RNA sequence: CGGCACCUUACGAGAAAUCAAAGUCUUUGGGUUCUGGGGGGAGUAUGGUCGCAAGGCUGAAACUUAAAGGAAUUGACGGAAGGGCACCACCAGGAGUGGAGCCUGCGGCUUAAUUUGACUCAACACGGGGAAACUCACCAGGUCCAGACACAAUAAGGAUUGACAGAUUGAGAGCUCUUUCUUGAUUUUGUGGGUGGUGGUGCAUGGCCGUUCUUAGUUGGUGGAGUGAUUUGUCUGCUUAAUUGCGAUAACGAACGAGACCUUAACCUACUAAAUAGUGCUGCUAGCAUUUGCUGGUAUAGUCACUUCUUAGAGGGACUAUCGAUUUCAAGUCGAUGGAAGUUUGAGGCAAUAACAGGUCUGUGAUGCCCUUAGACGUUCUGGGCCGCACGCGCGCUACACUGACGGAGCCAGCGAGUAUAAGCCUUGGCCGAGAGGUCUGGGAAAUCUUGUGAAACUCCGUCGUGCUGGGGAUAGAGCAUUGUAAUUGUUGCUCUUCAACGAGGAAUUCCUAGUAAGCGCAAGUCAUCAGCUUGCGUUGAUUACGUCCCUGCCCUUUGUACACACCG
């Protein structure tokens, strides 16, 4: 029996950030070499190999299991 | 009496119907076989032939 | 003879009311004069004619309209007559309400929302509506898709979901913003399509309820009246709680409703049995006068007896029984004796033909349709509000004092409820606490245990002693507990403290005839706490009627109608 009105500006729900070929940033394929694995996959037992962290500012996080190191 | 009420849904509204029925009281097998006020009278056994004073030895 | 008429009947006539003419008229003819041709316009205009005038006589059309009207039937309605019934009427009475305070609902006012429905009976302690989250439909802010399913776009080189820390935000809602992390074709955009709403529409509805009215009314078969719609049956009088019966009777016999019926209450020393009931005995045990008794405890083996009191299944019993009276000597009524019960034995449940703009779309996965449906009127979450008060109204209570307050002593009911890996039930009994409350056990899934719910009024014994007193308990201040995530706008109680109006209430008006009214408490409900409320129970226990139509209301008959969407015409 009333018309609803807002005050704050309309929000936009967060969209997943599309990264072009995300897998490239995890390895540096050496010529006549081995796999690099520079990104130091999370040592939690839940995520084994192939699941890497995030070399962010002052924290290292993997989205598989919600933990951070330093 | 057995009573049944069902709502019939038409495109324009609801049709609530009630089909109220009776079976024959004399056809009842477990409860009373008639109405409470049902008074049944049997027939007379009078108008017999009476004779003065006989005696039958059996 | 002539009249003015009147009564019955209908040979006959009539659409019928009716008619001795309105008959002797489709079996159409005694003479003759006048008049009408759907309703209005309209007895109007014009012309003529008569009149002092007012007016009379003669007298259209255009246009407009599907009806206007007659007699009667049913119903509805009446500011009409006659009857009947009723403590939702009165007579005679009892208790009240209406005076103050409070609780609560209503309108009103304010509000951010103070949600809203309902407004004589038939609105206002009602929505089982005693609202902290929830309820909530409202307000300020926040989320999610829990948008199924077909497609089109995108999309594995990733459609996209979840997200540590900080900022934001109330939030440790990755809600979003800084952040580069992680799953992977369930998923992202649009279309259809949906779906969900305490949104609106009870004046679009179902289903239920209330009301008419739980009043006693309703209906057909055959016959009779009538051309018919209809009517009689279904009614003067009496009787009954009653259309229930007697009776009268163009009616006769029937059906629904009422009554019967069912639940509950009473009686049963007569049955069936009762260790989840009791009793008398029987043990063993106790205190007193010792009289062998009076009181008790115990006894799931005293392997006692019984159903009488308590339970409930089978039954029985009352049908106005018998008698005195009145009555149409009928239906009944009134007085006795018996009886347990003689008011339908008491009180309730179900309850007719159709119907209402009675109430509800706020209970529904009951709904049609309008609105909306991703920044949701959907949901979720936090905080608020329904409580908010310049006012009037009602359902209740507290009382206004001595037929009383406190303080002791005594101390009897009945209806009911109560649980497990829970989300905590009834809680005893013991232990702490002035109180409220706190701790530890145990019984009961139940006639066992809670609980003999030892309820209060009440009876007694004391103070108080007419004072607003010690009647009354508003308004307010301090602490301790309880419940809940959360008690502030006191949940509630408890302890102390404050010590209000009220000294019986106007005009008015309500309920009620016997365990009924009225005092008095108790339980179940909503409920985690909250009962001044309802629903039921039990305790004490009356006054006066046992009549009437004076008021009011309803019903029936007569009557009237230009109403039938029915006087809100
Ligand atoms: Zn990890």
Curated annotation (Swiss-Prot), chain A:
Top-level lineage group: Eukaryota
Chain positions recorded as Zn(2+) binding sites: 42, 47, 62, 65
Subunit record text: Component of the small ribosomal subunit. Mature ribosomes consist of a small (40S) and a large (60S) subunit. The 40S subunit contains about 32 different proteins and 1 molecule of RNA (18S). The 60S subunit contains 45 different proteins and 3 molecules of RNA (25S, 5.8S and 5S).
Summary of the function given for this chain in its UniProt record: Component of the ribosome, a large ribonucleoprotein complex responsible for the synthesis of proteins in the cell. The small ribosomal subunit (SSU) binds messenger RNAs (mRNAs) and translates the encoded message by selecting cognate aminoacyl-transfer RNA (tRNA) molecules. The large subunit (LSU) contains the ribosomal catalytic site termed the peptidyl transferase center (PTC), which catalyzes the formation of peptide bonds, thereby polymerizing the amino acids delivered by tRNAs into a polypeptide chain.
Protein name, per record: Small ribosomal subunit protein eS31
Full-protein interval shown: 80 to 149 of 151
Curated annotation (Swiss-Prot), chain B:
Purpose: Component of the ribosome, a large ribonucleoprotein complex responsible for the synthesis of proteins in the cell. The small ribosomal subunit (SSU) binds messenger RNAs (mRNAs) and translates the encoded message by selecting cognate aminoacyl-transfer RNA (tRNA) molecules. The large subunit (LSU) contains the ribosomal catalytic site termed the peptidyl transferase center (PTC), which catalyzes the formation of peptide bonds, thereby polymerizing the amino acids delivered by tRNAs into a polypeptide chain.
Compartments where located: Cytoplasm
Assembly with partners or alone: Component of the small ribosomal subunit. Mature ribosomes consist of a small (40S) and a large (60S) subunit. The 40S subunit contains about 32 different proteins and 1 molecule of RNA (18S). The 60S subunit contains 45 different proteins and 3 molecules of RNA (25S, 5.8S and 5S).
Name of the molecule in the record: Small ribosomal subunit protein uS3
Similarity remark: Belongs to the universal ribosomal protein uS3 family.
